Design an enzyme around this catalytic site. Sequence first.
Site, mmCIF file in Angstrom:
data_model
loop_
_atom_site.group_PDB
_atom_site.id
_atom_site.type_symbol
_atom_site.label_atom_id
_atom_site.label_comp_id
_atom_site.label_asym_id
_atom_site.label_seq_id
_atom_site.Cartn_x
_atom_site.Cartn_y
_atom_site.Cartn_z
ATOM 1 N N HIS A 101 6.483 -15.131 18.111
ATOM 2 C CA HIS A 101 6.758 -14.766 16.726
ATOM 3 C C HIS A 101 7.718 -13.592 16.602
ATOM 4 O O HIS A 101 8.151 -13.252 15.506
ATOM 5 C CB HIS A 101 5.451 -14.480 15.991
ATOM 6 C CG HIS A 101 4.486 -15.622 16.034
ATOM 7 N ND1 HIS A 101 3.440 -15.682 16.931
ATOM 8 C CD2 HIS A 101 4.424 -16.764 15.306
ATOM 9 C CE1 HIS A 101 2.770 -16.805 16.747
ATOM 10 N NE2 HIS A 101 3.345 -17.479 15.766
ATOM 11 N N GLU A 155 -7.056 -4.834 -0.641
ATOM 12 C CA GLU A 155 -5.858 -5.447 -0.072
ATOM 13 C C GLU A 155 -6.266 -6.557 0.901
ATOM 14 O O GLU A 155 -7.373 -7.086 0.797
ATOM 15 C CB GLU A 155 -4.955 -4.399 0.590
ATOM 16 C CG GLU A 155 -5.670 -3.430 1.505
ATOM 17 C CD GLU A 155 -5.835 -3.972 2.913
ATOM 18 O OE1 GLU A 155 -4.831 -4.027 3.656
ATOM 19 O OE2 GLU A 155 -6.972 -4.329 3.280
ATOM 20 N N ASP A 162 -2.193 -1.683 -9.107
ATOM 21 C CA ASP A 162 -2.814 -2.192 -10.321
ATOM 22 C C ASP A 162 -4.312 -1.969 -10.320
ATOM 23 O O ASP A 162 -4.930 -1.794 -9.270
ATOM 24 C CB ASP A 162 -2.478 -3.668 -10.558
ATOM 25 C CG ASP A 162 -2.671 -4.511 -9.329
ATOM 26 O OD1 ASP A 162 -3.825 -4.628 -8.865
ATOM 27 O OD2 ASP A 162 -1.665 -5.062 -8.831
#
Lengths: 232, 237, 237, 237, 237, 237
Positions: C4, C179, C204
Amino acid sequence: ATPHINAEMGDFADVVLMPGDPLAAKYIAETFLEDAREVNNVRGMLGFTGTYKGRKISVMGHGMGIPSCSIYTKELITDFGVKKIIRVGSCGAVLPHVKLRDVVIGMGACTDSKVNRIRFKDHDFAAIADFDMVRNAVDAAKALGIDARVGNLFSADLFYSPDGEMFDVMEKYGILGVEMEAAGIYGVAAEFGAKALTICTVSDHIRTAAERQTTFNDMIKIALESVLLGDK
Amino acid sequence: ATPHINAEMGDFADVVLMPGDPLAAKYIAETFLEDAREVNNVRGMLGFTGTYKGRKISVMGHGMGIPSCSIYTKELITDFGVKKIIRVGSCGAVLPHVKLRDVVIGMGACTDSKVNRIRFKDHDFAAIADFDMVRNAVDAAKALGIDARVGNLFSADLFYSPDGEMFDVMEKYGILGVEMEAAGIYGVAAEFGAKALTICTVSDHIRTHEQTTAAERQTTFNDMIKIALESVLLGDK
Amino acid sequence: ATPHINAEMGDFADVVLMPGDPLAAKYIAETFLEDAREVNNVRGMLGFTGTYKGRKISVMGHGMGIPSCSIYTKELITDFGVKKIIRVGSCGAVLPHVKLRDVVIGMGACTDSKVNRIRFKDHDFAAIADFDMVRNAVDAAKALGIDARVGNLFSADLFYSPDGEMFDVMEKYGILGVEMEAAGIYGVAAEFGAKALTICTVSDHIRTHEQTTAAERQTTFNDMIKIALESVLLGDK
Amino acid sequence: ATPHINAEMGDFADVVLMPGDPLAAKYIAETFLEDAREVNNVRGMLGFTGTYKGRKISVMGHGMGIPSCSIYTKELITDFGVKKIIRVGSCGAVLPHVKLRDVVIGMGACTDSKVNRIRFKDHDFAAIADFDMVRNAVDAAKALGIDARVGNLFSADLFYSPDGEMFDVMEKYGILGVEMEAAGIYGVAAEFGAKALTICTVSDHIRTHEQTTAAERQTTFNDMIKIALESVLLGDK
Amino acid sequence: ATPHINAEMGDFADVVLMPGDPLAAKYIAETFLEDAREVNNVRGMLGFTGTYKGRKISVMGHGMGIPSCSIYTKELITDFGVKKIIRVGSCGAVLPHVKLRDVVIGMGACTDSKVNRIRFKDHDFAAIADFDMVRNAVDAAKALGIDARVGNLFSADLFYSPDGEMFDVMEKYGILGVEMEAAGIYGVAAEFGAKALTICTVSDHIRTHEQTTAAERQTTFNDMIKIALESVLLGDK
Amino acid sequence: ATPHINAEMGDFADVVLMPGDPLAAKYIAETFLEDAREVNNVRGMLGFTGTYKGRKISVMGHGMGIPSCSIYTKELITDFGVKKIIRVGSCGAVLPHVKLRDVVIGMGACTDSKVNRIRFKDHDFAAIADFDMVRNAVDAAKALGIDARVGNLFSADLFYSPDGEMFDVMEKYGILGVEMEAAGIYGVAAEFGAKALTICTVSDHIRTHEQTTAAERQTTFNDMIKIALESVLLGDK
C-alpha cells in the site's frame, strides 16, 4: 503460609465458615466456637479455628466480591487441605414474596462476572453448590424450625449497578437473593475439586439491630449444625 | 455514613490514597501523616485522615479486586466529597525490562472483568487515569530521582488464573504490571465524575516469582507513597 | 515498498503526521514544511517528506476507519522504521461543555470495533497513546496559547450508527470526541512496539448539530498541525 | 390444543416424564403405566397418560436438543397446567470415576447454547433443577439400591462438536454427564414458573469409547424410569 | 448404521429432502415417490427412499431445531454419502409484502444460535445455501409458474422468544422468514463439504397472525415439494 | 452534496461500480465508460459517471475496510438514489482449488467485524448479496467465457491479522477469497434497502505467496470489470 494467609497446614479445619466481614468472623468464633484461636490476620482478614460440639471448625472473612473470595477459598483448598467452605453472608431480595430476614440457600448462583466464562471457554457454566451440603443445610434448618428457601442466588460484580433493569430480570427468573461471592466460590470449588455452599439472610429488599442479631445467629447455627449432619 | 464506611462528610480529605491492605493504610497513616485520626473501621477497612506538609490527606484500604475497590471509591465520591483517588499498590511484571522496585504509573488499565462492558454497552471502554494526576506523579517522581514508567496496567479478576497464555498476550502488547483494581477504579471515576490514578511498585516478575527481602520491599514502598503525596501537592498548585 | 506504500526504507522521517484526508496531507506538506517531496501516491493516499525547523518530518493520509489506518501505520512501523505517529483530524463532541473548535488530545481511545478484542483474547484492552507524546502536545499547546483537553476519544466503526443511544453513553462516561481511528492506531502501536498520539479539533457538536465554517476550519486546522509539529521538537529534546 | 400438541387441558397430568425418543415414551406408557391413553401424536412426538400406583402421570417425547424440548415443555406448562417435568435420557461421561450405567442427576446444567443468555441479558444464568425434585429422585434411588450422583450436566447444541478441547474443560470442572436438553428445560421452567428435573444414565464414556450393550441399556433404562416415577410419589406425600 | 439412523450405506439417495415433521416425510414418500421404501424409523424420525421421474430420491424428517437437524444432516453426509440436503418446511413472515403461502428460498440464513460461532472462532460466518441449488429452485419454480422470493431466513433457537423486539430487527434487515434449522444445516454443509438449501412456505404472519386452511396449506406444501423435486432434476443436467 | 461526496443528485447512475482504489476507478472510467465525467474528488476518492453500451453507469473508489465503504455506500444510496452497488476488487485465496486470478463472486460474506452485530442485536447476520445480481454476474461471465465461482467471501478488519490460525478455519469452511468490504457493503444494502454484490479476482495466496506481471494483472482485471458491466445490462431485463 500463603500470599494472603499467615498460617500453616493444620491451622484450619477441613470446613471453613466465611462471612464477608472479618469482624463477623470474629463474632462467630467468640460466640459459637470453643477454645477459638486466631490463625490469620494478613490484610486484617480475621481467621479463627476452634470447636463446635466437639467438631473442629474454622471461620474467616472472605472480603467483598468474587475476586476477593476467589483468592481466599482457593488458598484454603490447595494449601490448607480445606474440603468444605460455607459462605454465610447477607443479600438483597428481588422477589416480593421473599421476606426481610429470610434465610436463602443458593443451590445455584447466577452472575455477571466473567470469571466462569474464562474458565469454561466462554460458555454457560452452572455455578452450583454441593448437593450434600445443601441437603445438610435444609435438614439442619428444619431441626431448628427456621424457614429456608432453596434456589438461585445472583452474584453481582457491582454493588452499585448502572443497570436497574437487570433486577426485573432476576425477579422474572426467580432469583432468591443478590450478593457478591457465591458464583465465584462455586467456580473455585469446581476448579480445585472441593465443595461449597452459600447461605444468606435477606438484609434488605432492594425494590433494628434486635432482629438483625438473632436472625444472623440462626444462619450460623444452620451452617454449624449442617456440618455435623454431613459428618454422619 | 455509607453502607461500608461509617463516617460523615468532612471526615475525608478531597483526596484519598488507597492500598488494598487496610494494614498498609495504617502504616502509611502512621509513617507519613501528621495528626492522623482513624475515620473508618467498618469491615476492618481502615481509613485515616491527617496532613502531609500542610495538606489534608486521607488513606484507606479498598480490599482486593475490582468489586471491592468499586464499592469504596464510589461511596467516597458520592457521600464524602472525594475528588481524587490515588491507588497505591503493587503489581507483577510481565515485561523483561521492568525492574523490581520500578514504579509503574497506570495511565490506562486493561482488564478481563466485565464491569466496564456492562457500563459501556458491551463496547471497549478505555479505562484511563486523569491526565493531570498522571503528570503530577511523573513530575514528583523525577523530582525524587525515582525511575517511573507510564503505560498500561492489567487488572485481573483472578489472582489464580487458569489462563497462563494470557501473560504472553499482556507481554506482547506492553502491559507494564498486573494488579486487580485499576480498571474498576477508573470505571467508577468516569461513571461518577471524579479523577483517579493508580501507582504501583513492582513486587516481582510473574514468570519466576522471585523472593523479595523485607528491606527492598519497604524501601520501594516508601518511594511510591512519597510520589503519591508529592504529586498531590503539585496538583494543588 | 509495501502493498500500500510505494517507497523505500528511509523515504520517511521517523515521525509521521497522519490526517485521514490525503489532500490535507498535501496541504500540510506545502504549507508547513520546507523542501517537501511526495513519497507515496498508491491508492492516491498521498505521502510527503520534508523538514520543519531543521527536523525531518513526514505527513501522509491514513484514510477513513480503523481497518484503513491499521494498514498504513503498520506498514510504516515495520517496513519504514517509523517510531512515532501523530494522527491529526476532526471529531464530533457529545459533551455540552466541549466547544466547537476545541482541541482534544486522546490519552485513551474507546471503540466499538473488534480489532483489539481479537488481539487481546477478547478482554478489555485500554487503547492508549504514548504518555510523552501526550505531554509534548499539552506543552506545545500551552506555548501556542491554545487550550487543549486531555481524555478519551471514541473510535467508531460506523459513521452512520444505527444506535443513537450510544452517544448518551459516551457523554455519561466523559468521551471528549467521536472519530474513527485512534483506538485502531493505538492498537497497532502496541502490537508492533511503536508510539502513537491522536489530536483532534471539534468540527461539530452532535448535540447542537453545529458545524464549523470554511474559514473556522482552516484556523483550527493550522492550530492543530502547529501543535503536532511543535510537539515533535519537544520530544527531540 | 397448541401448535405442537394436539390435546386439550386435562389430557396431561401435572407431572410429565420426558425422554428424547417418542418410542421410548411409548415404551414407558406400556410398561410402567396403566390405562395409558395416547394424548398426542403430532409430528409423531408420542405423548401418553395413565397412572402409576394410583398416581395420574403423563409421558411424552421432547425431541433432540434445547430448541426442540423448549417448545414442548413450554406448551405443557402454559397450556396444559403441567407443574413438574422430569427428563429421562442417556448421557456421555468425561470423568474417569464416572462409570458406564451410572445414574447422574443434574441439579445444574451447563450449556454452550445461547438461549439462557438471550433470556438473561447475556449474563450467566445458572440453569438449575428444583431442589425437592432432586432429593425426591435421590431418595427413590436409595429405596431401589441405586447410587445417584448429583451435580452438573452439559447440554450441548452439537452432538458432533468441532471443538475436541471442550471435553477436557467439562471434565476439569466436574461435569457428570453430557446430554442435549437439561439447560434449556431448566430455562423454560424458570421463565414460566415451573419445576423441572433431569435424570440421566451413562450410556457411554467419551474417553474410553465404551458403550453399553442392548441389555444394559434396557435394564438401566427401566431403573431410571422407576426412580423417576417413584420420586414423583415422594413429592406428593 | 449411525447413532440416530438405523440403515446402511446405499439406503439413501445422494440427495435428501427433509421436512421437520416425520409424518410430512411419510406423506411425501407415499404421494410423490414411486416404490417408496422406509429406510429409517429410529426415534420415529421416518426416512424413505424411492424414485421421482426415474431419479433416486430420499425424504426424511429432521425434527425441530438446529441441534436436531445437525445430527441427521451430519450423519447423512459422512456415513451415507449424501451430497445434497434440501430442507422443506414452513416459516413465519415479518415483512409486509411477503404474502401468506408465498414460497421463500433461503439463500442465506441468519441465526441467534451459537453453533456457527463455535465453528468459526466467534466471528460472523455467513450461513449460505449452495448457489446452483438455489438457481435450480428458482428456475424449477418459474417453470411451475410459482413465484419464489430469494433472500435471508432467520433460524431461531427459541420458538417462544422472550424478545419480541427482535422481529422488528428482522423486518428492518429484510428477513423473509423465521424458521429453526436453515443456519444449522448450512453450518453442517460447510463443515463437512456438502451442499444444502432450505425452501419454505409462509405458514403465518408473525405480524398479523391471521390464518390458513388445511386445504390451502396442502396446496402450498405440494408446490414446495414439486419445486424441490424438480430442482433436483434441473441439477442433474 | 454529502459529508464525503461533493456532488448533487443525478450526478451518479443508479448503479455504481466500486473498487477500493480511486485510481482503479479512474482507470475503469477512462477504459470502459463513454463521455466520462468526474463527479467527486473529496478525499481523493474519485468518482465518475458515463455510459457503457448506452447505459448510464457510475464508478468510484470506496477506500479500504468496512468502515470506509460503509460511509460511501450509505451516502450513495440515501442521497444519490443509487439502487445497486457492485464492488470489484481483489482477494486472497485460502483454498487450493481457488487458483490465482480466478474470479470469485460473493453470494455471502463472513467477517470478524462487529458492525453487523451492532445492527443485528448481537446475533448472526448472514451478510448476503442480491440474488439476481449474483445470477446476472454468473451469466455475464459465462457469455464472456470466464470461470467464476459463487460462495462465501470473508471481510477482514485487519489486513495484518495477529491470528494466523483463522486462515485454516476459513479454508475448512470453504471461504473463496479474503478481502475487507463485502460484509460491510451487504450490511449497508440491507440496512438502507438497496442491492449489492461483490466480485473479486484472486490477487495472491496466503498459502504460497506468489504474484504476477503488470500485464496479466490488468488482463484479468478488465475481465472482472466486463463481467460487472455486462451483468448490469442483463439486470436491465
